[PDB]
């Protein structure tokens, strides 16, 4: 069942806010993985000053040994090998040839953050882009195929790349209704038509006057993973609910959710999203690790990260992902997937127009 603790998402939601307010399309990312990226970058700096201050909300109590077992544990729970779903989170440093990579940092990277470093030649932008993009395919089973093009590597010394993959089954699937199309009344444009799936059942639900939105919980098998949909109220937009969501406003709204009989109508969707995270990371104040006086002494022998790339994909259908109260998601709505044993925000996204 649902998570009864307190989530460490003060930063995760700050970051979601920034992305969502810069994209009038569908979005999907992994806030937990962005935190892994920022901590791999902390491990590599000599501060392991301002960098210390800016990463306050990502590092556990200025004690590296806790940072590592913390992020190591959340990772192991999410990706725990079970017979009901498969979730994989993968990070890799693509390092230019003239950079001497320290083995112990590779050792840290593999052990505590499920990460790697790999040597490439940016002198052959095509062979390198090929190597990255085939790795992206190797560790997402083909769900994702490409994240960089040779043009996006210009000036690249180090390119930090993170993706995430998910395949799971609903505890309670929907009936197949071949011909179940209805309107979707999004913000931009005239309405559109989208494929829906319907069922009635017992699900955690609540209507939050605080955030002015409804909340639904759809669980996956494996006794670990559940998907939350947050659908604003008819008189309210997505950006309006966001401006109200913080760590405590969101904690209370999910606590109020107990099972009720729900009529659930949800638009099927299938898509993927990518952004280069340097520019939004500086908007939320993480700027020091991007200055010209920025170093990586514990990664390379005495340079910074050139570009940070992340990409995820998400699907929901009648059987899952990659497979009386009314919750009728026929307008824009937010979603996220969470490790319900610990509250890790593995996925987070939004539907501005659901296509499949």
UniProtKB/Swiss-Prot annotation:
Gene knockout outcome: RNAi-mediated knockdown in female causes spontaneous melanization leading to the formation of melanotic pseudotumors and a shortening of lifespan; spontaneous melanization is reduced in double SRPN2/CLIPB9, SRPN2/CLIPB10 and SRPN2/CLIPB4 mutant backgrounds. During the mosquito midgut infection by the rodent malaria parasite P.berghei, severely reduces oocyst numbers due to an increase in ookinete lysis and melanization. Does not affect ookinete formation. Causes proteolytic cleavage of CLIPA28 and CLIPC9 in absence of E.coli infection.
Effect of residue 321 to E: 3-fold increase in peptidase CLIPB9 inhibition. Does not affect interaction with CLIPB9
Lineage of source species: Eukaryota, Metazoa, Ecdysozoa, Arthropoda, Hexapoda
Family stated for the protein in its record: Belongs to the serpin family.
Job description of the protein: Serine protease inhibitor that functions in the melanization-mediated immune response. By preventing the activation of phenoloxidases through the inhibiting of serine proteases CLIPB9, CLIPB10 and CLIPB4, negatively regulates melanization in the hemolymph. By preventing melanization, has a detrimental role during P.berghei parasite mediated-infection and invasion of the mosquito midgut.
Alphabetical UniProt keywords: Glycoprotein, Immunity, Innate immunity, Protease inhibitor, Secreted, Serine protease inhibitor, Signal
InterPro entries for the chain: Serpin_CS, Serpin_dom, Serpin_fam, Serpin_sf, Serpin_sf_1, Serpin_sf_2
Organism: Anopheles gambiae
Protein name: Serine protease inhibitor 2
Subunit structure: Forms a covalent heterodimer with protease CLIPB9; the interaction inhibits CLIPB9 protease activity. Forms a covalent heterodimer with protease CLIPB10; the interaction inhibits CLIPB10 catalytic activity. Interacts with CLIPB4 in the hemolymph of immune-challenged female mosquitoes; the interaction results in CLIPB4 inhibition.
Post-translational events: Protease CLIPB9 binds to SRPN2 via the hinge region resulting in the cleavage of the reactive bond. This leads to a conformational change in SRPN2 which traps CLIPB9 and distorts its active site, resulting in CLIPB9 inactivation.
Superkingdom, taxonomy of origin: Eukaryota
Effect of residue 321 to W: Inhibits interaction with CLIPB9 but does not inhibit CLIPB9 peptidase activity. Cleavage of SRNP2 by CLIPB9 is not affected
GO molecular function: serine-type endopeptidase inhibitor activity
């Amino acid at each position: 069942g649902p998570f009864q603790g307190q989530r460490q998402n003060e930063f995760d939601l700050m970051f979601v806010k920034e992305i969502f307010k810069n994209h009038n399309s569908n979005v999907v990312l992994s806030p937990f993985s962005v935190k892994i990226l920022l901590t791999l970058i902390y491990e590599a700096s000599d501060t392991s000053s301002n960098t210390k201050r800016e990463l306050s909300s990502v590092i556990q109590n200025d004690n590296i040994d806790h940072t590592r077992s913390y992020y190591k544990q959340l990772l192991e729970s999410a990706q725990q090998d079970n017979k009901d779903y498969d979730l994989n989170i993968a990070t890799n440093f693509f390092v230019d040839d003239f950079i001497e990579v320290i083995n112990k940092y590779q050792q840290i990277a593999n052990t505590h953050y499920h990460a790697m470093l790999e040597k490439v030649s940016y002198s052959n932008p095509t062979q390198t882009a090929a190597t990255i993009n085939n790795w992206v395919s190797e560790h997402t089973n083909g769900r994702l195929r490409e994240i960089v093009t040779p043009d996006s590597l210009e000036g690249a010394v180090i390119t930090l790349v993170n993706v995430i993959y998910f395949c799971g089954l609903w505890t309670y699937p929907f009936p197949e209704v071949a011909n179940n199309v209805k309107p979707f009344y999004g913000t931009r444009g005239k309405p559109t038509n989208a494929q829906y799936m319907e069922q009635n059942g017992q699900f955690y639900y609540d209507n939050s006057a605080d955030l002015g939105a409804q909340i639904l919980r759809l669980p996956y098998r494996g006794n670990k993973l559940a998907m939350y949909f947050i659908l604003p109220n008819p008189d309210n937009t997505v950006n309006q609910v966001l401006d109200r969501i913080n760590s405590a406003s969101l904690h209370q709204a999910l606590w109020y959710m107990e099972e009720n009989e729900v009529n659930v109508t949800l638009p099927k969707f299938k898509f993927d999203f990518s952004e280069q995270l340097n520019e939004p990371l500086q908007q939320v104040g993480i700027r020091e690790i991007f200055s010209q006086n920025a170093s990586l002494p514990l990664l390379a022998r005495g340079v910074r990260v050139s570009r940070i790339f992340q990409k995820a994909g998400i699907t929901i259908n009648e059987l899952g992902s990659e497979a009386v109260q009314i919750f009728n998601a026929n307008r824009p709505f937010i979603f996220f997937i969470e490790d319900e044993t610990l509250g890790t925000m593995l996925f987070a996204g939004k539907i501005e127009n659901p296509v499949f």
